[PDB]
Amino acid sequence: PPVSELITKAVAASKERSGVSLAALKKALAAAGYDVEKNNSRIKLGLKSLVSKGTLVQTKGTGASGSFKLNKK
DNA sequence: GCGGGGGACAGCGCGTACGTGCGTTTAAGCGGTGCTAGAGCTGTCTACGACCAATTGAGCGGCCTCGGCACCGGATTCCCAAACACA
């Protein structure tokens, strides 16, 4: 399954008012059996694609270093 | 021993400052010349310090006193850490 679903599912499972950090996303995908080490660069890209698709709102920071929430709009 | 909160450490981004490279300029390095100030050595003779015996008073041990400082309690003050006021 593509990493955009795994990320969206992790952000939905940890839904809050702040927003899953990249470190929490790493932890959730690793707990989901996804190798976050080798494919970290893929994650940053896929995450960026999800922000560029507007599917994730950046709530703090800039780019992948930030916190993110599912764009309910 | 325990609760917790701040700091250490991890991850990311970015932007500019440092490394690499190239061409030009500059002055370091080398050699060579010349000059003279001063370092190094020597002889003299003289004032200056070591040595010694005698004198003595300055300093050291021993005693004694009191005041400066330590201590205690009581009152004063000074940050602090919430804490709510209020925009």
Question: How far from A30 is each of A26, A27, A72, CA to CA, in Å?
Answer: 6, 5, 25
- In whole angstroms, give the CA distance from residue A52 to residue A32: 24
Q: Are A67 and A19 in contact (CB under 8 A)?
A: yes
Q: Is A19 left (phi over 0), alpha (psi -120 to 50) or beta?
A: left
Method of determination is cryo-EM
Hey, what are A20's tokens?
Answer: 């899953």
Q: Which helix (H) or strand (E) holds A26?
A: helix A22-31
Compute the distance between CA of residue A73 and CA of residue A31 in angstroms, rounded to an integer: 29
CA atom of A16 to C1′ atom of B17, Å: 42
Scanning every strand, the nucleotide with its C1' closest to A65's CA turns out to be B12
Q: What is the distance between the alpha carbons of residues A34 and A6, in angstroms, rounded to a whole number?
A: 9
Domain boundaries, chain A: 1-73
Contact A26, A36 (CB under 8 A): yes
Task: Kindly give, in sequence order, each residue whose CB lies less than 8 Å from that of residue A47, ignoring residues fewer than 6 positions away.
Answer: A7, A22, A25, A56, A64, A68
Query: What is the experimental resolution, given in Å to one decimal place?
Result: 4.6
